[PDB]
């Protein structure tokens, strides 16, 4: 078996290899990349997402989210407080202000130490889940707004035609902005391109060990666990690498820099944080190997998850027994 230790693999496709997206994902998996839950892909030197980022300041962040923490440094939840709208130019200025800017630090490891020591004592503001794309329409390779759709994948594999669409989201981050432990909706893949700015550090649990993370989460957030059988779907729980190590949870970490893609694989739990002002674009996608994960994906029916209507059809077709109970939570 390839990659038996479930290490995060890093790929350097040539421009020729970068033409066929599906084929390259299949290649990565042939090398065992999916066993980690996360892979990095460094694009060919000849490739670019767009010509410049000089004209993005007028994008609106309609609902910036202030991420307020509760708990202890290594085990905490965060809730999202809605703030007034601001442009990306205004957001960048805020990110760079004395209150919110990245502190002095020696290297990525030093900054990581500071993040886990001090995160809970601040409330950074995140612009998340903004529908849109920063890929140039003329970028033909790995354009996250031009991928084959999950609906078409389901149709090709299973012969079922369903409603729904599948478009990218933009994320504007600043120092300490945080993404909680989660897998994707319906345990889909995700692909994430860091367009510009400061890095993003990722933590990931191998898919074959996801239930170990779930068991620890139930122990660490016992009230949340009693409230919902899939509360990590709420995307509010953080557990530090120190606490994961103390509890023997297998995981890896890696830092993504501007110009790099990350792919998360079905049922690969991940979490992380931004180093400073940045902008990422991400979208979910599927392959034939995903279908069995979609069938088995755990759902939040307590009603806190609140997802896109695109998910209605996935649950309806792949999880018809759960559909009635799941839709009540949505409605």
Ligand X SMILES: O=C(O)CNC(=O)C(=O)O
Angle, vertex CA 248, rays to CA 247 and CA 252, nearest 5: 115
> What Å distances lie between residue 56 and 16, 31, 160, CA to CA?
30, 38, 39
Q: Find the shortest distance in angstroms from Cβ 272 to Ni ion.
A: 9
Q: How far is CA 135 from the centre of its chain?
A: 18
In whole angstroms, what is the distance from residue 113 CA to residue 242 CA? 10
Residues 300, 313, 315, 318: which binds Zn ion (CB under 5 A)? 300
Determine, following the binding rule CB under 6 A, whether residue 25 of this chain makes contact with ligand X: no
Pair 24, 240: CB distance under 8 Å: no
Positions in the binding site for Ni ion (CB under 5 A): 190
How many residues sit close enough to ligand X to count as binding (CB under 6 A)?
7
Which of Zn ion, Ni ion, ligand X, none lies near 224, with the C-beta cut-off 5 to 8 A by kind?
none
Q: Which of 246, 212, 230 is nearest to 297 (CA)?
A: 230
Residues 282, 297, 300, 311: which binds ligand X (CB under 6 A)? 282
Q: Long-range contacts of range 321-329, CB-CB < 8 Å, 24 or more positions apart?
A: 325/301, 326/299, 326/301, 328/301, 328/303, 329/299, 329/300, 329/301, 329/302, 329/303, 329/305
Which of ligand X, Zn ion, Ni ion, none lies near 282, with the C-beta cut-off 5 to 8 A by kind?
ligand X
Determine, following the binding rule CB under 6 A, whether residue 263 of this chain makes contact with ligand X: no
In whole angstroms, what is the distance from residue 107 CA to residue 118 CA? 17
In whole angstroms, what is the distance from residue 69 CA to residue 237 CA? 10
Determine, following the binding rule CB under 5 A, whether residue 88 of this chain makes contact with Zn ion: no
Q: Pairing state of beta strands 9-11 and 38-41?
A: parallel
Q: Find the shortest distance in angstroms from Cβ 3 to ligand X.
A: 20
Determine, following the binding rule CB under 5 A, whether residue 304 of this chain makes contact with Zn ion: yes
Which of ligand X, Ni ion, Zn ion, none lies near 134, with the C-beta cut-off 5 to 8 A by kind?
none
Q: Find the shortest distance in angstroms from Cβ 224 to Zn ion.
A: 9
Determine, following the binding rule CB under 6 A, whether residue 279 of this chain makes contact with ligand X: no
Closer of 88 and 262 to Ni ion (Cβ): 262
Which of ligand X, Zn ion, Ni ion, none lies near 300, with the C-beta cut-off 5 to 8 A by kind?
Zn ion
Residues 280, 305, 315, 318: which binds ligand X (CB under 6 A)? 280
Q: Find the shortest distance in angstroms from Cβ 40 to Zn ion.
A: 31
Name, in order, each residue with C-beta under 8 angstroms of 58's C-beta and a sequence gap of 6 or more: 87, 88, 89
What does the per-residue mask of binding to Zn ion show for 222-261, with x meaning CB under 5 A?
------x---------------------------------
Q: Give the N- to C-terminal CA distance of the chain in Å, as an integer.
A: 44
> Is 270 annotated for ligand binding?
yes
Site for ligand X in 139-198 (CB under 6 A): 171, 179, 190, 192
Determine, following the binding rule CB under 5 A, whether residue 302 of this chain makes contact with Zn ion: yes
Q: How many CB atoms lie within 10 A of CB 163?
A: 10
> Is 209 annotated for ligand binding?
no
Q: How far is CA 131 from the centre of its chain?
A: 15
Binding-site ranges for ligand X (CB under 6 A): 171, 179, 190, 192, 264, 280, 282
Binding-site ranges for Zn ion (CB under 5 A): 228, 300, 302, 304
């Amino acid at each position: 078996a390839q990659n038996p230790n479930c290490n995060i693999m890093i790929f350097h496709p040539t421009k020729e290899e970068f033409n066929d997206f599906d084929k390259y994902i299949a290649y990565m998996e042939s090398q065992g990349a999916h066993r980690a839950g996360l892979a990095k892909i460094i694009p060919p030197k000849e490739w670019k997402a767009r010509e410049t980022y000089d004209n993005i300041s007028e994008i609106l962040i309609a609902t910036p989210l202030q991420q307020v923490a509760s708990g202890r440094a290594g085990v905490f939840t965060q809730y999202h407080k809605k703030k007034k709208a601001m442009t990306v130019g205004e957001y960048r200025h805020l990110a760079n202000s004395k209150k919110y800017q990245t502190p002095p630090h020696q290297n990525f490891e030093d900054l990581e130490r500071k993040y886990w020591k001090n995160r809970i004592y601040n409330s950074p503001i995140y612009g998340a889940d903004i529908s849109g794309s920063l890929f140039d329409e003329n970028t033909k390779q790995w354009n996250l707004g031009h991928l084959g759709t999950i609906q078409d994948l389901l149709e090709k594999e299973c012969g079922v035609v369903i409603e729904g669409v599948n478009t990218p989201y933009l994320y504007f981050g600043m120092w300490k902005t945080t993404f909680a432990w989660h897998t994707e909706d319906m345990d889909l893949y995700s692909i994430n391109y860091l367009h510009l700015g400061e890095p993003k550090t990722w933590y990931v649990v191998p898919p074959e060990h996801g239930q170990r993370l779930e068991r620890l989460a139930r122990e660490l957030f016992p009230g949340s666990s009693r409230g919902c059988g899939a509360f990590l779907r709420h995307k509010v729980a953080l557990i530090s690498p120190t606490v994961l190590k103390e509890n023997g949870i297998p995981f890896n970490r890696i830092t993504q820099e501007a110009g790099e893609f990350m792919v998360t694989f079905p049922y690969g739990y991940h979490a992380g944080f931004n180093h400073g002002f940045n902008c990422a674009e991400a979208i979910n996608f599927a392959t034939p190997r995903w279908i069995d994960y979609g069938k088995m994906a755990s759902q939040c029916s307590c009603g806190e998850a609140r997802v896109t209507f695109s998910m209605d059809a996935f649950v309806r077709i792949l999880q018809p027994e759960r559909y009635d109970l799941w839709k009540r939570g949505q409605d």
